[PDB]
């Protein structure tokens, strides 16, 4: 509650400064503070929340992958025993990553999702819930791996159901949701055919709706469509 004494508007202002300074841990703490003021977030504020924690967890995920690769190489045949240090430090990074994911999921559960009535906010937060369960799933190995995966799947599915009912196929949130659910299928759920089908249907349905858009909206939608195409090119 270290941000409890700062005004909501000052927290948002400082989150934007932290972004300019590439101080994403600060940015996340400011936006957590803003969320804990208890008011719903605007579109811009939701983006700030997402940018901050995307960059924090992004650094942790990249570090975890470096360390996991070293750990796995240490457990091949002919590898010298180097002691517990690699495992220990990988566990340290993994625990910090899980703590960030838990923090985000806690904000969504208390009480961003329950107060989100509009499709754009509700889908945004449910996508975020899927994303941060997906990051937990990337590092999970024990008894709860399956339940973490199902938690991600359930959040993404509720978001998809709403987005398909309430949003046009070119909406960037809908597009980024489908992109990420497709990555979930490919990388987490061992369902590459589901991933490919989802990416292709999403891309084709957005293509057929581009004619309705302004030039600026067209640029926003085609940016995410190109990521879908990039993945299909990687996967096929």
């Amino acid at each position: 509650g270290a941000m409890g004494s700062m005004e909501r508007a000052s927290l948002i202002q400082k989150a934007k400064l932290a972004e300019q300074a590439e101080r994403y841990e600060d940015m996340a703490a400011f936006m957590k503070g803003a969320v804990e003021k208890g008011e719903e977030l605007s579109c811009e504020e939701r983006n700030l929340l997402s940018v901050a924690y995307k960059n924090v967890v992004g650094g942790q995920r990249a570090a975890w992958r470096v360390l996991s690769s070293i750990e796995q190489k240490s457990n091949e045949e002919g590898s010298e025993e180097k002691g517990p240090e690699v495992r220990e430090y990988r566990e340290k990074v993994e625990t910090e990553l899980q703590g960030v994911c838990d923090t985000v999921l806690g904000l969504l559960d208390s009480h961003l999702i329950k107060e989100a009535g509009d499709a754009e906010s509700r889908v945004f937060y449910l996508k975020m819930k899927g994303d941060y369960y997906r990051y937990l799933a990337e590092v999970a190995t024990g008894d709860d791996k399956k339940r973490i995966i199902d938690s991600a799947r359930s959040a993404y599915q509720e978001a998809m159901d709403i987005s398909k009912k309430e949003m046009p196929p070119t909406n960037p949130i809908r597009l980024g949701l489908a992109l990420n659910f497709s990555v979930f299928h490919y990388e987490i759920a061992n369902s590459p055919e589901e991933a490919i089908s989802l990416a292709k249907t999403t891309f084709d349905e957005a293509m057929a709706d581009l004619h309705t858009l302004s030039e600026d909206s067209y640029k926003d939608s085609t940016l995410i469509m190109q990521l879908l195409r990039d993945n299909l090119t990687l996967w096929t």
């Binding site: 901050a52 990555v183 490919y186 926003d220």
Partner: peptide, 7 residues
């Protein structure tokens, strides 16, 4: 794979 950027 690429996942979604922040807007």
């Amino acid at each position: 794979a690429h996942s979604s950027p922040a807007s």
